[PDB]
Design an enzyme around this catalytic site. Structure first.
Site, short mmCIF file in Angstrom:
data_model
loop_
_atom_site.label_atom_id
_atom_site.label_comp_id
_atom_site.label_asym_id
_atom_site.label_seq_id
_atom_site.Cartn_x
_atom_site.Cartn_y
_atom_site.Cartn_z
N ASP B 193 14.68 2.21 75.92
CA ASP B 193 15.72 1.23 75.62
C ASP B 193 16.91 1.37 76.56
O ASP B 193 17.97 1.81 76.14
CB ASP B 193 16.14 1.28 74.14
N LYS B 195 19.92 -0.22 78.44
CA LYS B 195 20.79 -1.40 78.38
C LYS B 195 22.27 -1.01 78.62
O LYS B 195 22.59 0.17 78.47
CB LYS B 195 20.59 -2.18 77.06
N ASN B 198 24.20 1.35 76.16
CA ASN B 198 23.86 2.76 76.16
C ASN B 198 24.37 3.46 77.41
O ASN B 198 24.02 4.63 77.64
CB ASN B 198 22.35 2.94 76.05
N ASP B 211 22.44 6.95 73.03
CA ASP B 211 21.49 6.26 72.15
C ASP B 211 20.02 6.55 72.54
O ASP B 211 19.24 5.64 72.88
CB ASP B 211 21.79 4.75 72.05
N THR B 232 15.10 -3.48 73.47
CA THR B 232 15.95 -4.67 73.25
C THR B 232 15.31 -5.94 73.85
O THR B 232 14.76 -5.86 74.95
CB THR B 232 17.39 -4.41 73.75
#
Ligand SMILES: CS(=O)(=O)Nc1cccc(CC(=O)Nc2nc(-c3c[nH]c4ncccc34)cs2)c1
Ligand SMILES: CS(=O)(=O)Nc1cccc(CC(=O)Nc2nc(-c3c[nH]c4ncccc34)cs2)c1
Lengths: 395, 395
Positions: B193, B195, B198, B211, B232
């Site tokens: 994940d 993004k 984070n 995260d 995401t």
């Protein structure tokens, strides 16, 4: 109260052999959780199943490393009882010879009473008196509790009395050591409740130590205890501990002094002063000690021995020792030449054990129902919880 | 052999990676008490007496051990489905931290992950200036807590929302992401994940990934086998997207797809597969071949456009399929202001100008649900035994 103090306080709480949360009690807690949850019925719960799956490898490693019953070689069953048995054992690795008291976890839960061993463990583990048998390691398993203690090769006073017509000079010795051994327990804040020859053991040198602290209780703020418990074989038990059938009162450390009179009477007279065939018969005679206590005609008992016995075999209110040990010590029966109270354990014993080897079991008579186990529970019953924290190790 | 058995067991209680260290052991007892303490269960004497016995003790432990009341909350600087992040100050040490809370209730009520375990290990043991550091992890009947280093610089989402990011800044932030991702990969994990949400900034303006909730350890072939998609919508890779039961065998190239999405967003201003509906975003990711287009942005260089397209391609020809060095060697990174090996020692594009130790200017502000009382032993605290990172920690 500072952050570090909070950390340090918690860290030393895990190291303390007296703490309720040291690494041994904490481990016991996990070991119990695995024992009480591992059932097909309970495992249907994912929280339970996944927990048990996770700690399987680990719990087994722990079980193997931690002290176990398989680490000792049994030599003889030198004692038995309702719940357990004592056995002369040898540690397979260290080669060291010990006495190990076993207690069936099954029976103690079936027959209740599963809190007596707590004072038996602490007294033997922390006492640090030459008057108390020492606990080296206490450990458990799904089936029993174990206590690894110092082996007393001299046998008990029951055996001694059974082999000799005890002369007054020997009785004066054995009583004095009991007065000292009892005072030590009292100084630790405990009442023995069932002092008897069966619990008087002799070391290699022929000196006393008290054992079987199973009946012990911790005294409150006024040096007193209360119980609703039923006592078996009342021969050595005091009128107070007997009138306590249902918690019908309190009693102090004078209840241990009654038993000393019973022990002195037995060594010199040859029988217990309140003996009767039935148990109910013994009880009746204890209650009526005023008229039931009589001596024989053969005055092979001195004036001062007869007096100490009667000074101990009286109602609590005028019992010798109601005003402390020093009034017992000052008694004329103890007036002697051979020893001084403060150096009695350094004196030469009346009977010195002559022993063949480290495992000589000559003073112990040899011993000869199948094992009953806890049923598989449908729900969480937590049979192991009353014994979490029993495990003790000496460094 | 003996002593080796003692040492092996002693080292098992000290290891911050052991399943039976003091932290886990203390957690186990704390769980047993929380879980048994209900009027229904207490009707069982084994349970009731156990609890009664350990009441005084469990409470002492609870007070000493780290608790949520030790921290003074300053601002809820983040939220999520199961928990919330909050800027907090340790009342005693005065130290300022970021604390991630996770409802034990929400987790148990369908989690399908147990993600919090790798999120704990990565932050606690990583030891990289590219990963947010876990200092303490602790729990209670209601939540799990992670006490980490506070990142005052905010996230990349905030930065992008306040600036039209120039190419020189994008080259910086991307390079640090390439390095921070390579570190996770070097630890044998796929972030899954990646993004801007984070990407956090320290007081100096330098990146750290956060995260690690979606993390998963690679196999000996450097792959992961997931039956269900993770991450995401905009940043998910087409392979992590399709990832069926029997299929779903992807490597660390899924983190490189997200980097392209991050680069495209900083320079173009929108996500490349952005669509009104979320289902619209999915369709465009699958059809990246035709859907990835650039606007009439003279400002996007030839080499920036190339890196994005080199990352926004099918796994089989994605830049980084042959390791980091082929990403690092890209012309887009060609510059005369930093060197890969010394980038974190260079002066950041945006240096946070902060008011104090508790400056929360970069974080916008944000403003019950509980387990029912069980009739039987349900053991809701067992899946979290061993979460605590306090007594046995890696210093
Ligand atoms: C009444 S019960 O079922 O609740 N428990 C129970 C079960 C079995 C036996 C007994 C007696 C007993 O307490 N024996 C003990 N023996 C030592 C000891 C220490 N060292 C030694 N050396 C030689 C010889 C015996 C020792 C201490 S207490 C009590
Ligand atoms: C969706 S869920 O409910 O499953 N999980 C969940 C719940 C609450 C918040 C979030 C986002 C999140 O993970 N935020 C994080 N913040 C830090 C951090 C470290 N230092 C810092 N400094 C400032 C500011 C935040 C930090 C690490 S992870 C995720």
């Amino acid at each position: 109260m500072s952050f570090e103090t909070r950390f340090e306080k918690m860290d030393n709480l895990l190291r303390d052999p007296k703490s309720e949360v040291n690494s041994d009690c904490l481990l016991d807690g996990l070991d119990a959780l695995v024992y009480d949850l591992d059932f097909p019925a309970l495992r249907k719960n994912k929280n339970i199943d996944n927990f048990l799956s996770r700690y399987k490898d680990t719990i087994n490693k722990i079980r193997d490393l931690r002290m176990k019953a398989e680490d000792y070689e049994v030599v003889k069953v030198i004692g038995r009882g309702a719940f357990g048995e004592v056995q002369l054992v040898r540690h397979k690795s260290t080669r060291k010879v010990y006495a190990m008291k076993l207690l069936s976890k099954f029976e103690m839960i079936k027959r209740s009473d599963s809190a007596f061993f707590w004072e038996e463990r602490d007294i033997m583990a922390f006492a640090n008196s030459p008057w108390v048998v020492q606990l080296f390691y206490a450990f458990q398993d799904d089936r029993y509790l174990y206590m690894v203690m110092e082996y007393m090769p001299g046998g008990d006073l029951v055996n001694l009395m059974s082999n000799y017509d005890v002369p007054e000079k020997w009785a004066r010795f054995y009583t004095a050591e009991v007065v000292l051994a009892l005072d030590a327990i009292h100084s630790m804040g405990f009442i023995h409740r069932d002092v008897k020859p069966d619990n008087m053991l002799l070391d290699k040198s022929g000196h006393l130590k008290l054992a079987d602290f199973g009946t012990c209780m911790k005294m409150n703020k006024e040096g007193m205890v209360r119980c609703d418990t039923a006592v078996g074989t009342p021969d050595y038990i005091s009128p107070e501990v007997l009138k306590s059938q249902g918690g019908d009162g309190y009693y102090g450390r004078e209840c241990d002094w009654w038993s000393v009179g019973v022990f002195l009477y037995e060594m010199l007279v040859g029988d217990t002063p309140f003996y009767a065939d039935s148990l109910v018969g013994t009880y009746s005679k204890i209650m009526n000690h005023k008229n039931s206590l009589t001596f024989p005609d053969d005055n092979d008992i001195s004036k001062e021995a007869k007096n100490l016995i009667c000074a101990f075999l009286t109602d609590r209110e005028v019992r010798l020792g109601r005003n402390g040990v020093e009034e017992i010590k000052r008694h004329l029966f103890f007036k002697n030449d051979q020893w001084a109270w403060e150096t009695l354990r350094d004196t030469v014993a009346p009977v010195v054990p002559d022993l063949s080897s480290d495992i000589d079991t000559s003073n112990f008579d040899d011993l000869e129902g199948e094992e009953e186990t806890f049923p598989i529970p449908k729900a969480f019953v937590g049979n192991q919880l009353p014994f979490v924290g029993f495990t003790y190790y000496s460094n």
